[PDB]
Design a protein around this nucleic acid. Structure first.
Lengths: 332, 87, 332, 87
DNA sequence: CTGTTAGCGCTTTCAG
DNA sequence: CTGAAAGCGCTAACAG
């Protein structure tokens, strides 16, 4: 434990500039004299100090990650995605929950940089103009993962929530649907307003079915917003023939409330979701959804950050990742 | 040096499965690359692999080439099998 | 460059020791100076590097936390209650997934330790014998969370799994159940063989309603396993009027399972899960599940650990947070 | 100095809601106390509050004793309802 | 290959 | 209260 590097320099009877080498598999050191020292090392119980080194070498081999909430499956999988990769590349990570609130993100980003990180993976649902003023000042590489960025000024990783919007709905147009509604999350959110509705919309105007502003019923992302969004859409008027939901947990509500009034999901109303989270199979008629690989985003995000931190010029700081449709049984 | 499988796992070449595969194929000196639907990528890279978008039922070809080339194949074949993504 | 302790020393015209004492906000340094320094400080934009200070003080103000899988609902909540409190206590949390497997848990420990944490929230589904060994010889405090190990040699937080289960079965027994089965996670993991099955068993031998080792079918903790554990149990001579699932996801796979077979969960066979993650609500017959305070385990697992690091000592190193059930529609 | 609330929030005094009641009572110097079911706990200890297991419907008594009692009480009222736990 | 010489940026006994 | 060295353990130029 306290047997410092110097303590070992004695057992091995070599300098410390030398154990420093053995410890890190340095450039040349006799196989006999290296396993000689590494030998008396384990003998003791010496444990290299990551803080002494951090200081002496200005690198910690730890990244800082700031996601809204590791409690919500979305981020957690994304987080898993990051961790496995940081580890794959011998990095420890520092996790902190911001909860999408403007101050903490900056506090954290400070404590982070203050805690001497080697890179930052930031993720939020609304990357304010200030954030970029902010994030661009950092002294280390920074990348967004599935995070809503505008000027494409700071490296990001994601899938075209716009195309994925279009592709998803199109599927529905191709089958004979003129009255297709759209449930979604907080309107004050880029992913929604910015790309979600955009895709949905152009989808129709592209087919010639301008859309009823009302046909964009929203709500907080829970299963609650589901039976909610349904009841409202239905009784209201026109009783759409198909729905589209901004996530999976909502799509579920969309499906039960539709079964509650009396409709048949596979038939009468065909619904379709986004994300395709575990729960996409955990429902009555399994929910056809638009695949968003949150694990690859995080995995990739961290990997990009890995190059930057190792100075390789791996350009295309804006990475897109294949999304896709998975029709299980929901949509005829 | 070469082998063709068909991912039969419902996630295809994604999430852990793909990292455990790359990783599994990142411990070999011989080169190795995964090809599919026209594109070919370094099977040693996490950015490359998760670019293809490989879904289930997709068909892929693993090609290794180097001093370890031989075992390189047995190794990834196993991991494909025991990780149950491709058989 | 980036900015130093000595810098503030000039701009404030005080001694680096003065600057140190205000950043640390230690007692006594006249309001006259404590003030002067603090301006020189936020105007100059200083940020002290936690690494340099770690070396100096033997303290990093950050804890390691081994964890099975952060992607998993159960631990994701556990990891939020932790973080939540570690923040509350000005603590940063390093984190790496272990995958319940014995060798990683032991590599993380030294990577963590050498990184110099100040505490370690350890949590596994199977504490080993060699486990308590290296844990007892750790330099820094430690406590297990949503994890249990025999000898009680280590501080810890958890629930009464034996009672938690026994009460569930009981809820059924008293209702008119003679045949009730147990679909559970990996029997080779103590959480199952040690307290889950025991609870279940006794509950029966208690009311004198004996048990066929057959009724104890084993699945992994997957939604599918739940569909597989029901079809097997329905492929029994005298089918069980009730089941007890060691998870809610699993229980979700048992519910749909019976439905896709021909039984309507509430009547034909009542189903009671464990944990009470959001999922319970997302199912047709809302799933009645024993309740376990995930957030509370970590909340408490971490706060407790702050006591040990913060030298204060309070007695209750083996906390058992209460439980209860939540009867939804799934059963009486 | 004090008050009695009907904890009506589904999760009772648990999770994020709870971790806040315990934060807000820590911002005030006064001595804050919470009794429930006849046992008492420092409204400032997360390990104490969280270990009681107050369910929806329980009746709890938050009590302040000291210089700022009022600021806090007037404080653990707002939080209580802004976090919707009691009346 | 391997030593030797310096610090990295803070915090601390002690002193006055 | 407030300076003043004395380094925490390491690594990093640069010898040899």
């Amino acid at each position: 434990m306290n047997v410092t590097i110097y303590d070992v320099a004695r057992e091995a009877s070599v300098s410390m500039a030398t154990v420093s080498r053995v410890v890190n598999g340095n450039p040349n050191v006799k196989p006999s004299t290296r396993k000689k020292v590494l030998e008396t090392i384990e003998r003791l119980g010496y444990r290299p100090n990551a803080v002494a080194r951090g200081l002496a070498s200005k690198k910690t081999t730890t990244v800082g990650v700031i996601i809204p909430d590791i409690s919500n499956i979305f981020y957690a999988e994304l987080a898993r995605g990051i961790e496995d990769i940081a580890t794959m590349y011998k990095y420890n990570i520092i996790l902190s929950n911001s909860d999408q609130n403007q101050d903490k993100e900056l506090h954290l980003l400070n404590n982070m940089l203050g805690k001497q990180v080697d890179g930052i993976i930031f993720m939020s649902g609304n990357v304010t103009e200030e954030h970029v003023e902010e994030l661009k000042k950092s002294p280390v590489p920074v990348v967004l993962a599935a995070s809503i960025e505008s000027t494409n000024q700071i490296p990001s990783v994601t899938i075209d929530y716009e195309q994925a919007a279009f592709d998803a709905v199109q599927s529905l147009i191709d089958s004979g649907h003129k009255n297709i509604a759209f449930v979604s999350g907080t309107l004050e959110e880029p992913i929604n307003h910015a790309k979600k509705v955009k895709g949905y919309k152009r989808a129709l105007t592209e087919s010639g079915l301008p859309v009823r502003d009302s046909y964009i019923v929203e709500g907080d992302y829970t299963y609650d917003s589901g039976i909610e969004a349904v009841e409202k859409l239905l009784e209201e008027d026109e009783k759409p023939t198909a729905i589209f939901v901004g996530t999976d947990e909502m799509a579920l509500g969309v499906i039960h409330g539709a079964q509650d009034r009396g409709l048949n999901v596979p038939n009468d109303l065909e619904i379709i979701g986004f994300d395709n989270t575990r729960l996409s199979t955990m429902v009555r008629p399994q929910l056809t959804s638009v695949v968003q690989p949150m694990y690859d985003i995080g995995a990739v995000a961290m990997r990009l950050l890995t190059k930057y931190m190792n100075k390789e010029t791996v350009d295309s700081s804006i990475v897109q990742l294949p999304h896709r449709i998975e029709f299980r049984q929901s949509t005829k | 040096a070469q082998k063709t499988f068909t991912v039969t796992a419902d996630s295809g070449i994604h999430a852990r499965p793909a990292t455990t595969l790359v990783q599994a194929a990142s411990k070999f000196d011989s080169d190795i690359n995964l090809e599919f639907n026209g594109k070919t990528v370094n099977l040693k890279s996490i950015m490359g692999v998760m670019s293809l978008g490989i879904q289930k039922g997709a068909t892929i070809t693993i090609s290794a080439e180097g001093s370890d080339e031989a075992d390189a194949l047995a190794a990834l074949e196993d991991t494909m099998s025991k990780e149950g993504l491709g058989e």
